[PDB]
Symmetry: C2
Subunit: 174 residues, 2 copies
């Protein structure tokens, strides 16, 4: 799904994306910048769709999970705790119900085990970002551990691509 499609399915998505962009304004650590959050949300979208789980919870949790990363860089306050508290304050103002907000907040709180489906999907989505083509590109610019079967398959696929990349690099280097 593209963003237009996500915005058709997820309430307040545009405003949440906006808030996330604003939070990350001038936080450019390539290891933790905003593009990571967008890739995590793409991974969460794939996983939740294929697992037949709650997409709204998964997407929102992914968008918000590192929203307090810049704040941690300034203060040393743990971003998972801070991000969970932030989600609990923000989300009720957008009409999300108590159980929805509690699940999203707990997922963020647990992301660095998680106990909910949203938390498991979030953690998988986050950790998948350490592997693949973009991860390879980042290194140069500077699978059984996953909860869900969909993430495990994605991890296997990305890992096998990374292995091939290394093998080729070494074979070509001589």
């Amino acid at each position: 799904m593209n963003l237009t499609e996500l915005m058709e399915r997820i309430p307040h998505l545009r405003e949440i994306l906006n808030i996330v962009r604003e939070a990350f304004k001038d936080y450019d650590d390539p290891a933790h910048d905003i593009s990571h959050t967008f890739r995590v949300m793409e991974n969460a979208s794939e996983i939740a769709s294929r697992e037949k789980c709650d997409l709204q919870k998964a997407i929102i949790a992914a968008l918000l999970h590192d929203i307090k990363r810049p704040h941690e860089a300034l203060t040393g306050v743990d971003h998972a705790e801070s991000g969970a508290e932030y989600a609990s304050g923000l989300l009720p103002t957008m009409g999300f119900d108590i159980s929805f907000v509690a699940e999203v907040s707990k997922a963020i709180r647990s992301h660095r085990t998680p106990t909910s489906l949203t938390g498991k999907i979030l953690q998988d989505a986050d950790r998948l970002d350490a592997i693949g083509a973009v991860a390879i590109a980042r290194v140069f610019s500077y699978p059984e551990t996953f909860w869900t079967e969909t993430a495990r398959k994605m991890a296997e696929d990305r890992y096998s691509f990374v292995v091939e990349f290394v093998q080729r690099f070494l074979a070509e280097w001589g």
Copy 2:
């Protein structure tokens, strides 16, 4: 083949490698540094072996083909012309015969069409270095056009890997 194996088959290889290293000492342009020459020689080794062509000529031509690149950077004198003249002077002193030296020299002279098997292999080996895993890594740190069937297959393989890399990058980026 590893270098020990090449040194078992190719006269004066160690001394030639030594001379090449010395030529490149303090020439660090990542687009034209010594590691390119070594990758070209690896490509030439594969191609000449599989094509049942003269390995000695192919290897030596690959090692020497850009030996005057650093000199071109300083003077503007074309490295293909300069490299061919250099090979014609150096190689007879190592006991290579007139026809061998002329072929290697012409191959270097023509590498930027070539008319000999050595020149065709050299050009393929050189141009293959623009694609593949190491080429991808270089970009981030900063097939039917090939003469031989072996290079065409290698080019197809590397190009299909590059395409997959791009596709994955884009899919992951969101």
